Design an enzyme around this catalytic site. Structure first.
Site, PDB file in Angstrom:
ATOM      1  N   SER A 118      -0.687  15.769 -12.136  1.00  0.00           N
ATOM      2  CA  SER A 118      -0.951  15.328 -13.508  1.00  0.00           C
ATOM      3  C   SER A 118      -1.218  16.546 -14.394  1.00  0.00           C
ATOM      4  O   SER A 118      -1.811  17.524 -13.885  1.00  0.00           O
ATOM      5  CB  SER A 118      -2.103  14.370 -13.422  1.00  0.00           C
ATOM      6  OG  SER A 118      -2.602  14.106 -14.684  1.00  0.00           O
ATOM      7  N   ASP A 165       0.830  -1.201   0.000  1.00  0.00           N
ATOM      8  CA  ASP A 165       0.000   0.000   0.000  1.00  0.00           C
ATOM      9  C   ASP A 165       0.869   1.257   0.000  1.00  0.00           C
ATOM     10  O   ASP A 165       1.360   1.672   1.056  1.00  0.00           O
ATOM     11  CB  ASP A 165      -0.908  -0.034   1.232  1.00  0.00           C
ATOM     12  CG  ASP A 165      -1.818   1.176   1.334  1.00  0.00           C
ATOM     13  OD1 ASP A 165      -1.935   1.907   0.335  1.00  0.00           O
ATOM     14  OD2 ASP A 165      -2.391   1.378   2.439  1.00  0.00           O
TER      15      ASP A 165
END
Ligand SMILES: CC(=O)N[C@H](CCc1ccccc1)C(=O)O
Length: 330
Positions: A199, A35
C-alpha cells in the site's frame, strides 16, 4: 466458464462471511468461509468427532457417488488466530455459483478446535491463497481456484464483500457494474504464499495523506484491519477516550464516539473505509466500551488487510503468471 455466488455475513458485526458450496453427487450444500489467506478446502464431516460438532452441516462422503478417498493423504492446519483442524482427504465434485471442478481435494475434518465447534454458522473453509500453502501430505493439493483457472474465461476471481449486507464472489470475469471509477492493479508477491502487496500510505479522517510503503496481505478470512503500531496509534488518537487495553487485547473506545474514516493507498488511488466500518460494537453484552476494527499487527509478523478494509472495495484477485491485485471504490 464463470461462477457467481452470494456471500452473507454470519452475524450483525460482519465477523465473517459464508458462501454456499455444492459438494458431491447428489449435491451436499455447505456454507464455507472463503479465505484468501489460506489454501485448504476443509469441511465438517461425518468423520468429525461428534462432541466437536454443534449445529454445522456436515459432508458425508459415503453418500456421494463421486467421492473417492485420497489414499494416505492427511491434513492439519493452524490459523493465525490459534484455531486448528485436521483429518483425511477425499476427492469429489465441487461447485461454486455454477462453476464446477471435478476431482477437487475436499479435506474432511476428524478434529476441529473449539472456536470452530462454537460457530454453528461456518461449515468449513475454502482457501483461495496460493496452493504452495496447502497442508495436505504427502501430496500437496490444489485450491479450487487453481483447479478451475484453466477453464475460466479469465484467470481471476473477485471479492465484493458487503457492509452489514450480502455481497458477491465471482470467478472468471470482472463485473464492470459492481464498482465505480476504475480498478487499480498493484503487484503481488507470492513468496509467502499470500496475496501480498504494498500500500502507498494512509490518511485518518480528513487528515493529510501520509505516503509510506505498508506491505500486507489481502485476507478475506480475517475480520479486522491489522497495521503497524504507528499507523494504528495515529488513527485511535483521533477518537476521544480510545485506548489500547492489555486485558481485552486491543484498542477500545467509548461506544458513544463517532469514528473517523481511514483511507489506504493503492498506487495513486485511495480507498476510504467509513468510520462505521471500524465499529465492532460492545466488548461484552451491555458494555459501554466498543472494540475497534483497526488493530496493531505488531504481534502478528505481517500486516493484514482483512474484511474491514476489503469490504470498502471491489477487489480483483488475478491468478495469471504475473499476479496482481486490483482495487476499485464502489
Ligand atoms: C499500483 C502499481 O504500481 N501497479 C504496478 C503495475 C501492476 C501490474 C503489473 C502487471 C500487469 C498489470 C499491472 C506495479 O505494482 O508494478
Amino acid at each position: 466458464s464463470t461462477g457467481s455466488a452470494t456471500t452473507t455475513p454470519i452475524d450483525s458485526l460482519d465477523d465473517a462471511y459464508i458462501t454456499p458450496v455444492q459438494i458431491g453427487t447428489p449435491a451436499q450444500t455447505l456454507n464455507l468461509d472463503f479465505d484468501t489467506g489460506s489454501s485448504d478446502l476443509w469441511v465438517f464431516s461425518s468423520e468429525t468427532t461428534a462432541s466437536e460438532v454443534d449445529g454445522q452441516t456436515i459432508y458425508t462422503p459415503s453418500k456421494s457417488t463421486t467421492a473417492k478417498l485420497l489414499s494416505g493423504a492427511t491434513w492439519s492446519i493452524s490459523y493465525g488466530d490459534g484455531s486448528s483442524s485436521s483429518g483425511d482427504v477425499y476427492t469429489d465434485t465441487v461447485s461454486v455459483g455454477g462453476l464446477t471442478v471435478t476431482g477437487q481435494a475436499v479435506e474432511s475434518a476428524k478434529k476441529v478446535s473449539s472456536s470452530f465447534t462454537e460457530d454453528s454458522t461456518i461449515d468449513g473453509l475454502l482457501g483461495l491463497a496460493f496452493s504452495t500453502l496447502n497442508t495436505v501430505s504427502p501430496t500437496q493439493q490444489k485450491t479450487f481456484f487453481d483447479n478451475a483457472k484453466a477453464s475460466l474465461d479469465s484467470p481471476v476471481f473477485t471479492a465484493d464483500l458487503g457492509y452489514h449486507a450480502p455481497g458477491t464472489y465471482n470467478f472468471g470475469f470482472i463485473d464492470t457494474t459492481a464498482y465505480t471509477g476504475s480498478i487499480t492493479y498493484t503487484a503481488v508477491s507470492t513468496k509467502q504464499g499470500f496475496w501480498e502487496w504494498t500500500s502507498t500510505g494512509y490518511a485518518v479522517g480528513s487528515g493529510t495523506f501520509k505516503s509510506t510503503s505498508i506491505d500486507g496481505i489481502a485476507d478475506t478470512g480475517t475480520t479486522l484491519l491489522y497495521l503497524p503500531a504507528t499507523v494504528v496509534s495515529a488513527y485511535w488518537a483521533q477518537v476521544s477516550g480510545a485506548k489500547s487495553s492489555s486485558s481485552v487485547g486491543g484498542y477500545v473506545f467509548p461506544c458513544s464516539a463517532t469514528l473517523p474514516s481511514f483511507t489506504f493507498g493503492v498506487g495513486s488511488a485511495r480507498i476510504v473505509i467509513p468510520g462505521d466500518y471500524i465499529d465492532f460494537g460492545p466488548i461484552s453484552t451491555g458494555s459501554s466500551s466498543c472494540f475497534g476494527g483497526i488493530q496493531s499487527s505488531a504481534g502478528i509478523g505481517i500486516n493484514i488487510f482483512g474484511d474491514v478494509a476489503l469490504k470498502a472495495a471491489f477487489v480483483v484477485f488475478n491468478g495469471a503468471t504475473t499476479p496482481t491485485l486490483g482495487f476499485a471504490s464502489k
